[PDB]
């Protein structure tokens, strides 16, 4: 188990840690989250009581350092920082636990939800998408734009998701225009898997990260990337059988975890009807089809 202490909580805020969240009152004595499971990435996020616009937060991995939260009143947000003094850190953590001012990462033991949502997400790949190499953790928020969006403005603060574009030279071999546009298999398997992602676990990790950013921050370009990466698989006639079975699990847990009231803006009608009913893979997402039908039959 690891701990992320908080210097203070000066302003009323809803704090999230992975899929969990708590309400914290202005200058309430709150000094962190404990019992956080080592072994996966995590995200701690924030929504100030006074500005329901902008959700923001930090992706991190306890294995890569001792991380804590401090409110910055000039910039007006909770900031994650790294403590290099291993001793000073255990000392703050121990003293705060003794005084019982920390909330416990509330994992139900049966629950594999977070693992299922983050199976393929790696901190090293996140830091490539959110480039800020002076920190071991990565900041994301509601407004950040993606690289592809900027092509249609500040590069430092952008989400460098891998660019997918169905009407591009990269997606279409000259002479196989119709074949490659109806059957995206060569784009998925040669260009994207073998070429850029190297393997499906990185593709999956980026797909999953894009979903979580869409879900926790309502990041619109992240939702776009998630849907593109699903569509590319569903629109390929020829996919490794192991990718199909693992995609069905991945989507199942994403659809299951989604807040019911956000299904309108977070789920693209066209993609999902194509994946589930028209695409080559209509019959290959049994668990995702079943949960989508019983929980969101309106969208279809």
């Amino acid at each position: 188990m690891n701990t992320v202490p908080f210097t203070s909580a000066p302003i009323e805020v809803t704090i999230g840690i992975d899929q969990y969240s708590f309400n914290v009152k202005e200058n309430q004595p709150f000094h962190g989250i404990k019992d956080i499971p080592i072994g996966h990435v995590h995200v701690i996020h924030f929504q100030h009581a006074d500005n329901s616009s902008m959700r923001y937060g930090y992706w991190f991995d306890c294995r890569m350092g001792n991380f804590y939260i401090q409110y910055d009143p000039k910039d007006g947000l909770y900031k994650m920082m790294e403590e290099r003094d291993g001793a000073k850190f255990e000392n703050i953590v121990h003293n705060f636990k003794e005084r019982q001012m920390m909330v416990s990462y509330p994992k139900i033991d049966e629950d594999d939800t977070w693992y299922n949502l983050t199976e393929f997400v790696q901190m090293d790949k996140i830091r490539k998408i959110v480039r800020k190499d002076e920190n071991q953790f990565s900041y994301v928020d509601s407004s950040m734009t993606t690289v592809q969006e900027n092509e249609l403005s500040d590069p430092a603060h952008s989400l460098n998701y891998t660019v997918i574009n169905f009407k591009s030279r990269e997606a279409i071999r000259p002479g196989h225009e119709m074949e490659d546009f109806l059957d995206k298999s060569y784009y998925l398997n040669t260009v994207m898997l073998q070429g850029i992602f190297k393997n499906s676990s990185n593709y999956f990790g980026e797909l999953q990260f894009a979903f979580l950013n869409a879900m926790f921050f309502g990041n619109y370009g992240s939702s776009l990337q998630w849907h593109a990466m699903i569509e590319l698989i569903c629109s390929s006639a020829t996919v490794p059988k192991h990718m199909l079975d693992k995609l069905d699990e991945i989507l199942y847990y994403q659809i299951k975890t989604l807040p019911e009231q956000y299904s309108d803006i977070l789920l693209n009608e066209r993609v999902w009807n194509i994946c589930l009913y028209s695409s080559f893979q209509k019959n290959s997402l049994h668990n995702t089809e079943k949960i989508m039908e019983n929980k969101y039959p309106e969208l279809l």
Binding site: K167, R169, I172, M178
Partner: protein, 237 residues
């Protein structure tokens, strides 16, 4: 964006643009098999690529052989149209390449766009208009060269004959579409109107009769009357 009655006049500016109509690319007759099932038999077709400002028509004849052994032909026809339009663009000197291509059917957007990826500065555009270019095959000389073709072939025409020696491109296109509209709504009456008088002939290098200005006024009036007549009949109005 899409082309409608507002931005009609853009057609006649000096930006090169082509209309593409694919309605006549994949043409079949439907008949009964010996066992009583239904089968299709393909006949020769054509892409109707038209510069509305100059009247130049690039009539790409589509030979039934193209369909030989292929499935989902109606979908394939769209991709073949785009391949041929792309090859026509590539075949033209740069200064003759269109700055826009307007497709008469929205289904042609994705195939053309994919085929034109090598020409990113050529805008592919749909239209809201209801253009009557499917009736090109009611023009006898166009129907004849298409049906006689034994091999893929490109035939060039000016669909305005010599009209532009005397009228503007706005006017020529309005005459063309009136004539085609009429031919679409009641071909037999439209053709009767054009050919009633045997002393007004079609030049060998033309498609339409050599009407004087005054005879064109009468013709256009008769075509309008035909169209309104057929409209009252369709809707009992």
């Amino acid at each position: 964006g899409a082309m409608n009655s507002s931005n009609y006049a853009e057609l006649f500016n000096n930006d090169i643009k082509l209309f593409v109509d694919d309605t006549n690319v994949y043409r079949v007759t439907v008949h009964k098999t010996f066992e009583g099932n239904v089968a299709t038999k393909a006949i020769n077709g054509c892409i109707f690529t038209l510069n509305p400002k100059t009247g130049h028509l690039f009539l790409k004849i589509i030979h039934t052989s193209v369909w030989a052994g292929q499935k989902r032909l109606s979908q394939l026809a769209k991709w073949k149209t785009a391949e041929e339009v792309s090859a026509l663009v590539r075949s033209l000197p740069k200064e003759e390449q269109p700055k826009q291509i307007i497709v008469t059917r929205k289904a042609m957007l994705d195939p053309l766009e994919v085929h034109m990826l090598d020409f990113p500065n050529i805008a592919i555009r749909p239209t809201e208009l209801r253009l009557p270019f499917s009736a090109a095959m009611s023009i006898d000389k166009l129907s004849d060269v298409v049906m006689k073709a034994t091999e893929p072939q490109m035939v060039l025409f000016n669909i305005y004959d010599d009209w532009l020696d005397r009228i503007s491109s706005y006017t020529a296109f309005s005459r063309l579409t009136l004539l085609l509209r009429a031919l679409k709504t009641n071909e037999e009456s439209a053709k009767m109107i054009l050919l009633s008088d045997p002393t007004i002939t079609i030049k060998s290098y033309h498609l339409w009769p050599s009407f004087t200005d005054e005879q064109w006024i009468t013709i256009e009036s008769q075509m309008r009357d035909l169209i309104l007549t057929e409209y009252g009949r369709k809707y009992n109005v």
